A paper describes a structure:
To provide more insight into the state of BAM within a membrane bilayer, we prepared BAM-containing nanodiscs using E. coli polar lipids and initially characterized the samples using negative-stain EM, then moved to cryoEM. Importantly, we observed an outward-open conformation in all reconstructions, indicating that the membrane-inserted state of BAM is indeed the outward-open state. To support these therapeutic efforts and to elucidate the complex mechanism for how BAM performs its role in the cell, we report cryoEM structures of BAM in nanodiscs composed of polar lipids and native membranes, allowing us to conclusively identify the conformation of BAM within the bacteria membrane. And contrary to the other recent cryoEM structures of BAM in MSP1D1 nanodiscs, we did not observe an ensemble of clearly distinguishable conformations within the periplasmic domains of BAM. Although two crystal structures were solved in the outward-open state in the absence of BamB, we note that both are stabilized by crystal contacts. This data matches well with the cryoEM structures presented here, where all structures of BAM within a membrane bilayer were found in the outward-open state.
In Gram-negative bacteria, the biogenesis of β-barrel outer membrane proteins is mediated by the β-barrel assembly machinery (BAM). The composition of BAM varies by species with only BamA, an OMP itself, being fully conserved across all Gram-negative bacteria. Structures of BAM solved by X-ray crystallography and cryo-electron microscopy (cryoEM) show that BamB-E interact with BamA along its periplasmic POTRA domains and that the complex is overall conformationally dynamic. The full extent of this lateral opening was observed in the structures of fully assembled BAM where the barrel domain of BamA was observed in both inward-open and outward-open states.
Numbering used by the authors:
A (entry chain A): 25 to 806
B (entry chain D): 27 to 243
C (entry chain B): 23 to 392
D (entry chain C): 26 to 90
E (entry chain E): 25 to 110
Write the structure that this text describes.
Amino acid sequence: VVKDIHFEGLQRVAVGAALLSMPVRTGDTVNDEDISNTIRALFATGNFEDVRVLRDGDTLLVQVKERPTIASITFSGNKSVKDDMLKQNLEASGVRVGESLDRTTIADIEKGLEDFYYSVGKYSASVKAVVTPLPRNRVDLKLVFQEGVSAEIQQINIVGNHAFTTDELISHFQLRDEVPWWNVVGDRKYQKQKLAGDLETLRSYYLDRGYARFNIDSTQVSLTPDKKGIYVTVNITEGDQYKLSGVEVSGNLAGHSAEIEQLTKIEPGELYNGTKVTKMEDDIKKLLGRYGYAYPRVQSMPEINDADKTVKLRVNVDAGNRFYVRKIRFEGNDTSKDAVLRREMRQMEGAWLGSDLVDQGKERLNRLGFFETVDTDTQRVPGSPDQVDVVYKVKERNTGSFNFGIGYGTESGVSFQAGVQQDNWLGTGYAVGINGTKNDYQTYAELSVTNPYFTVDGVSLGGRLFYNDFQADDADLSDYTNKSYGTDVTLGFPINEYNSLRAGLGYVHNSLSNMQPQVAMWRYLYSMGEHPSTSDQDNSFKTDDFTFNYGWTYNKLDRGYFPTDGSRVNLTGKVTIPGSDNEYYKVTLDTATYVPIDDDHKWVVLGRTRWGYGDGLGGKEMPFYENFYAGGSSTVRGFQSNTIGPKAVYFPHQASNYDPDYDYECATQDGAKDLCKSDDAVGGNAMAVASLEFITPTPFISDKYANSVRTSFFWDMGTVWDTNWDSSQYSGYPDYSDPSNIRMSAGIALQWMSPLGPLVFSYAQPFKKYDGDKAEQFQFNI
Amino acid sequence: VPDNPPNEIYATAQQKLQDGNWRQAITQLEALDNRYPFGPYSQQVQLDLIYAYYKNADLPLAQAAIDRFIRLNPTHPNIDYVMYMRGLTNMALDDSALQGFFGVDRSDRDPQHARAAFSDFSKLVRGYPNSQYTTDATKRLVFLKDRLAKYEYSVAEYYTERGAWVAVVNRVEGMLRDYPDTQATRDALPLMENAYRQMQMNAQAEKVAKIIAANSS
Amino acid sequence: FNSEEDVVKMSPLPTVENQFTPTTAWSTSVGSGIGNFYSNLHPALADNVVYAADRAGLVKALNADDGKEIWSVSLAEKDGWFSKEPALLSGGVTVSGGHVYIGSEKAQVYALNTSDGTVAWQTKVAGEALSRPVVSDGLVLIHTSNGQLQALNEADGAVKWTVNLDMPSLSLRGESAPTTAFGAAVVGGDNGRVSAVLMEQGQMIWQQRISQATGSTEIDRLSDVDTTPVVVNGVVFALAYNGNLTALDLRSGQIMWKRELGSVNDFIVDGNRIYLVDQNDRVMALTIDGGVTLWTQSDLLHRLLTSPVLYNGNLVVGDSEGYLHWINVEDGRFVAQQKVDSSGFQTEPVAADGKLLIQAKDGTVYSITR
Amino acid sequence: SSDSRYKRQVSGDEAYLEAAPLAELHAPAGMILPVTSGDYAIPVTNGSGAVGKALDIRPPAQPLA
Amino acid sequence: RVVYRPDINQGNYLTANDVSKIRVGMTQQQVAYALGTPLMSDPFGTNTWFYVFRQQPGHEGVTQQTLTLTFNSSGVLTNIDNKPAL
């Protein structure tokens, strides 16, 4: 009878816990079978065994030394996989890292890692682990594993085809047979998933071309495991071209058989088509989904009859029950009135589910953006054959422009420019943008508040305000004093289910004092008839504009801020109604059409084109303060802001109410006293900027993010020109009346919109040889 | 990450906790967690770590850690405290934002966290009605049920705005059945009144009229 | 991105002493074209004639007389589904009489008869033929890597003896031309099955195998091999797909015993002496005593190819980077002296009639003679 | 995490003790409704402890070994 | 004024045959099997089932057909009132 048992060197499990753990204890007669029980209990655990059981008398010394605890954290050798991903494929697999590490598991997990590398598509021949024990019970493992990288090492082959070339069938594959990189469309890397995709694609190709009897094909992925031999051979057997002749429908539904039949009507002599029959299935599914049966069972069976090559298409459709939705739950919108997310839905709780309707809902949420996640999970309630709960999982992330400007001036104090453009204002669904700039002599205030919802229907109420005290002055005067009081309210209703029509009023008050020397401004003055001077700056011009402001917009973007498969058109037109101190007629049109080349939408071609044509009404010219600009924005990279376009030339003046001396060169007293060819951006009344960007996450940027970086390589052509121009006043100077000032500029734009701080790199080389331009090869927007 | 003795490192950790250097405190508490997953001090450090997560407002980490603790050791005198912070953490996920600090424009964002908090606090109060946290949990629950009722009132308001009358009636049904207690439900019942009257369900509308007239003073 | 391999690089060539200076490198070419595609083509020597081929559909009948071209044929059709139909010939090349059997991984076996004209008959075997077709007293054996082992009658092609071996998931590039012996063709498979087909109706006499290969128990990715059992005196030496050397002492039927000694690429046997190369790429020599090794060697580990052939006490080895390591006056002498190409080798060297021949990954045949 | 603040506070505002008291709806003659069908109900048998942020929200002590 | 609006649908889709099939005495389980699980129920008072089919398109008219059914303590359909079209 063992009576006193002492355990030492446990350090991971208490003495009492161990004492209760082993099936033997005090107070019982420990015999040979009990010793065997202790030893086998040490053996069978499978976590640690160390048997030192000495019983000399009534003292049982059980000495077990614990390899625990160890933390293997050191992954040294990654070059193509991330240690986070390795730890995932350890943990989520079911081999999570709380480690005891018996001696076997060393080599076992070495082999396990090598097996993981076998899985990803490459080879790893060497994995060396070093043990590092620190003496409490703690150890850490040094894994140095050596890479043998290989992803596409193919030579594809298809043996058995006699109606198609090898190359034609290999083209469509998601695997490629060792082809250059400028062939790539999306992702290529060889996985068993890729192979299954290829096999299914080949089957689809035959079943579409009309080879019905083919579903029979063996696959062999032979391997020179010198990391370079992966020969895929898919030995198949074609049938014969098969003629489709007639369809029968076994229909179990409250009656639509007319519509179903007219949808499934196959003209005589057609060839059997796998994708055509699949689209027949899906169109029956939607022809039911509209009317409600959002979980029908549709089975299409082809009946093959040989010796005449006949296929009979027999589809049996049975519908479930009719009207489902019980609750429409959004979960995830922690920072946004769901009243927003619910105004969006075109599928309304308490009605009959329509799968296309909740698809419209998901797309509409996306086209508002302000967040990014696909889901329209329709999980059905427990306990009823009806009643599905439409649950979206949005994932809010805040769009908001917080633009900080500090300094910098020397003779001018520290400036303060705050640009906060918040859309879908994280309080609500409103959009407020404030560009408030006090730069030591410039007071430019812009407030823009717009309700996308002002009734239930969708009318949008948007007001804008600009208080522009633009002086850019030297001392107190004779420096283009300009005041702009700008109010405008835009009531804009969506009526074409994707087309908004906006109508608004606008008051623009323009006060112009101490005119600068530009012939363009005096041409406008002559146009208005207010006879000016020509060598004195004592010019005053108070005007008020009552502009009717009509806009139009088409928006179809399969995403929000990073469109794919989309095309938005934006027309904006100011027409000044009679009854104002000024007249003009301006029309702008933007078009951003993203078209994707890849199916995976990691490659996209952006095409954005904007026209602008402004001209004054009969007897007037369009006032210069609305002449378009270009460049230095998301218009034309490769220029300083608002530089592209006609340059206004100066008239001489040697007295302008004390024309300041030693200032304002180009035909002043201190500079040249006679005529000056003057370069400065005044903007023209016509604009055309067309740009194409290539949206490409290159293999040099780590793609764990598809929502926070877009990398563009862009070619852009921009022109700004006057249309009311002449050579009777500009004869010796360059003439600006023809579109020929095309700037071509190409550049890289890395756009990292993690909500609050972008490093928007835009390096642009502008190369289209024209004179008077002003360029810049670094743009970091905000 | 020093290699001090346990007593010294725990003492410094506690002192920094009373001070309020919560990020640093989380660092050395996590170190003391790794260096032993054993010891009575290990349990004390797990609790201290959940406290530190809650205070530093690392709420996903706090929720994960508290669930791990309640899974690992499900009987303990402090399971009250465990469940209480899980409820409080769901609460803080509900009420943490710029507008949730402004005090304006809330009570109908995502309620999922509020629902989870209510379930947890209900489990707490029902499991241990004789405890220090009990009355505060009761206050939690009354406020939280009021918040849920406001959420479903807000959704009912939106549907009555758009015209979705049957959605209105179902949502106010949900409010009456699940909790006819808070102010929001008494506010809501005229929504049924108007909804039934709009869909011309006359006897039903008169019935809800009787209930609202009797209930209001 | 696909090339950062810190794997062991090729060991450098040892000292260059050698008693025999290669006195001839007679060369011929087509400018094609094996490339780096792993395949088993090689010239065959029939009556001082060198029937060479290469993966374009080009067959250049050469003769060992300084080698002018004869009978240069292009095997590719222009009718049907494409013009000139770019084919592949990862094919066996073998000769019986004037009958040149070539088998190509477009699922074709062409037989070109330079005997009474050009009798070029194409048999469409299942799968893609990859092993050197074997002539066996009225049969050509084709171990096509669909696990299938076709057997065809000469002069017309006639499918029969259509055995169906077992293939694993990786369905490897295991070529295994069945060796014919006493009316039994011993064919390796892609899983370890060393099946003997004693042609009665295509009857395999085997219920057992090598339990190790690539596909069920993957090993160090170096088990690339060209697998061919060899019959001598009534014993079949098999070195099947992954390294497990097996002796099969046929006593009125298949009788087995596995004296394991792995690391297999291909081998030659002379009476009581075995000369093979390893997957580790070292030239182990074996004596039939249970397999007590001689000639452990290390100088050439991880040369992408190394494949042996013997003549006149001098063991030849064709390796990558266009060398020919020669083994000789048997150890202690191991060194090598030859470099015939900067193109390289991937294919078998053939010794016959006292003439040694070597295909090259580009450039047709490079006969190297003492 | 602090600026000499936030020792007896929760992130954001608190309205714990400013909740509207619960008040069961009176039922007219025969118009009963299921007072619950779910988990949203509170036991009344409770109290009184340290309501509001005046309780030891810090980890409670226990003997060390 | 807005020129055009959405089209709103609210629950209990019916047809002429759908409303016609049922008759007095059929148990509510079979009633549900026939029409569908009604999602507008009166909670307080009698076990009555309201069937509402509501549709408002593009500013014109109204489509409101209501089929009211009254089951009793055991659950037996009686006293059916159909009001089509408002």
